[PDB]
């Protein structure tokens, strides 16, 4: 399962990727539980596209400190060596080659990647989520 970071709930917005029920999910709705007052997150699984919901974790790490948090995935950043048929050849920081790295069909990433890739390949990075063995490019950056 994906490595994670803890995100304060005040810093979570629609479109952020959270772990919901153990699954990396794009947040599509943020609401407050009437029963508990806590934030509830409705999200779309990046891989399966199924809906998942999870409420915030309330913790009390110190006197008068009440924290509502969620987990987000730790993104990896890969270089793009080539693009072929909806997948890319990516390279990790240590030179490990991923031949068939899926690109998520989300927010026109493939077209944005293609565009950025045609006008300087070396500066194109993909942000990659790695869940339960599976990896996928879910965003891109230019260095």
From Swiss-Prot:
Regions crossing the membrane: none
GO biological process, one term: positive regulation of translational termination
Effect of residue 99 to A: Abolishes the ability to self-assemble
Phenotype when the gene is knocked out: Impairs plugging of septal pores and leads to the loss of cytoplasm in hyphae severed by lightly drawing a scalpel blade.
Subcellular location: Cell septum
Function: Major component of Woronin bodies, fungal-specific organelles that occlude septal pores in order to separate intact from damaged compartments. Hex-1 binds directly or indirectly to the Woronin body tether that in turn is anchored at the rim of the septal pore.
Family (UniProt): Belongs to the eIF-5A family. Hex1 subfamily.
Name under which the protein is recorded: Woronin body major protein
The organism's taxonomic lineage, starting at the top: Eukaryota, Fungi, Dikarya, Ascomycota, Pezizomycotina
Positions spanned in the full protein: 29 to 171 of 176
């Amino acid at each position: 399962a994906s490595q994670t970071v803890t995100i304060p709930c005040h810093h979570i917005r629609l479109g952020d990727i959270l772990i919901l029920q153990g699954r990396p999910c794009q947040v599509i709705r943020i609401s407050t539980s009437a029963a508990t007052g806590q934030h509830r997150y409705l999200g779309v699984d990046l891989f399966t596209k199924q809906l998942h919901e999870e409420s915030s974790f309330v913790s009390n790490p110190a006197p008068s400190v009440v924290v509502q948090t969620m987990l987000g995935p730790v993104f990896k950043q890969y270089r793009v060596l080539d693009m072929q048929d909806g997948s890319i050849v990516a390279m990790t920081e240590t030179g490990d080659v991923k031949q068939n790295l899926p690109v998520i069909d989300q927010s026109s990433l493939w077209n944005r990647l293609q565009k950025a890739f045609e006008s300087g390949r070396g500066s194109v990075r993909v942000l990659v989520v790695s869940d339960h063995g599976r990896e996928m490019a879910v965003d891109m950056k230019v260095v």
